[PDB]
């Protein structure tokens, strides 16, 4: 099983250089083609380029001026570099292998989110969405956590350290007028169990981890 | 015109047939192969290879997916459509420079109407101390996606001071969830007593108003 893990910074200032690393674990990078693909917020996929088995390179024409894809065969890693980045380079970057047999990209990494901005990182405030009669219907009650004012993406929210997954709705974040992101995560539970409910908010770009207990009003 | 996908958006019921097309504008054939591949992309997941070389099914992909295009015309067929198939599908062309992706085809599942369960949450005391109030209205597990949410503060209807986001279509029951957040300063919040969330949806007989009174 080929495994691709991506690492690197998630916040880059404009005009600076974006650097990402892809670690491969299954086949050697001296075989096949090893590509980088990114995903814009519009859900559009743009192909960036690859480094070949012999070290040859092919890049997208629109990125050829400021892109670079290198490798390290001893470490079995290959790297992506993007110079003079602008806000238009904010995307989710993937590294994937192109098989010689398939002639398509069949093994991908989970991707890493990169934001291009001059604003510094900032931790999120976590506020409770307390369950009450205005959030109960039948034998089910709604509660959640308001994760407000963080930058940049992403923020991961779990409930009871991952033990509570059914009925969880973590909404896509919205960009507020202040430049900070805000998201809300809710969960519907049986009203007869009001059981301890704790939301786990993680914001790796700022090394912020907050556990907030949501108790009834 | 390099790569055109059709349709742009698609809405198909369960157990039925969904058909999509990818137009090449110039042949992607070389050495007896059609260098066009179909990818499935879900939220928070990388693109997944479905069909490679126009017509070959990738390992682990169900037999419901099939491809058959040639030279400049390609087709991806999903039959029968399942609830898990709700995603965006893209065709990739890699015969020559430049390697491009299609705009994508957003496939939506059709099901029976489900009325949203409406909830409203007053702003927490910790946030009011900071000097900002956020009122959250929740619409849970509804279909179709189209719904109208209107904030009513002192019977007056707010505008421009609210934002909302919708979850992606659920993989199991093909429903949507929506949350509307009304943001005001602490001063503006303390100027009004009643905060109401009015919800209009196809699956509801009459608009549902979920409200609370400040201080109570």
């Amino acid at each position: 099983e080929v495994q691709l893990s991506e690492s690197g910074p998630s916040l880059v200032k404009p005009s600076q250089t974006l650097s990402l690393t892809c670690s491969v674990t299954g086949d050697s990078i001296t075989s096949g083609y090893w590509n980088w693909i990114r995903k814009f917020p519009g859900n559009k996929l743009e192909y960036m380029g690859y480094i070949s088995y012999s070290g040859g390179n092919y890049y997208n024409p629109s990125l050829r001026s400021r892109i670079s894809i290198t490798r390290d065969t001893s470490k079995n890693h290959y790297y992506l570099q993007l110079n003079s980045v602008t806000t238009e380079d904010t995307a989710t970057y993937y590294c994937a292998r192109l098989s010689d047999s398939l002639y398509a990209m069949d093994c991908w990494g989970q991707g890493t989110s990169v934001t291009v901005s001059s604003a510094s990182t900032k931790g999120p405030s976590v506020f409770p969405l307390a369950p009450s009669s205005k959030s109960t219907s039948g034998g089910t009650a709604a509660l959640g956590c308001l994760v407000k004012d963080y930058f940049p993406e992403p923020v991961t929210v779990s409930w009871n350290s991952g033990a509570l997954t059914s009925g969880v709705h973590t909404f896509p974040a919205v960009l507020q007028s202040s430049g900070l992101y805000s998201l809300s995560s809710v969960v519907t539970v049986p009203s007869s169990s009001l059981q301890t409910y704790i939301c786990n908010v993680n914001h790796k770009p700022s090394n912020t981890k907050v556990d907030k207990k949501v108790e009834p009003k | 015109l390099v790569l055109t996908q059709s349709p742009a958006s698609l809405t198909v019921s369960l157990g039925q047939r969904a058909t999509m097309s990818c137009r090449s504008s110039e042949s992607v054939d070389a050495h007896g192969y059609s260098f066009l591949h179909w990818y499935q992309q879900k939220p928070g997941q990388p693109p997944k290879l479905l069909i490679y070389l126009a017509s070959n099914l990738e390992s682990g992909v169900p037999a419901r997916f099939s491809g058959s295009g040639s030279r400049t015309d390609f087709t991806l067929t999903i039959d029968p459509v399942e609830a898990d198939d709700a995603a965006t599908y893209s065709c990739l062309k890699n015969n020559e420079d430049p390697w491009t992706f299609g705009g994508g085809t957003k496939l939506e599942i059709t099901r029976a109407d489900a009325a949203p369960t409406v909830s409203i949450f007053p702003p927490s005391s910790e946030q009011l101390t900071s000097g900002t109030a956020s009122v959250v209205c929740l619409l849970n597990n509804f279909y179709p996606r189209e719904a109208k949410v209107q904030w009513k503060v002192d019977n007056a209807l707010q505008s421009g001071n609210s934002q909302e986001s919708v979850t992606e279509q659920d993989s199991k029951d093909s429903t949507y969830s929506l949350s509307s957040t009304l943001t005001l300063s602490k001063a503006d919040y303390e100027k009004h007593k009643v905060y109401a969330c009015e919800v209009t949806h196809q699956g509801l007989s009459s608009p549902v108003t979920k409200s609370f009174n400040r201080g109570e």
Binding site: Y33, Y58, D100 | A30, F35, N95, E96, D97, P98, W99
Partner: peptide, 10 residues
Amino acid sequence: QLINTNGSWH
């Protein structure tokens, strides 16, 4: 049995 150079297979 096919190799790619500058985007083209040959």
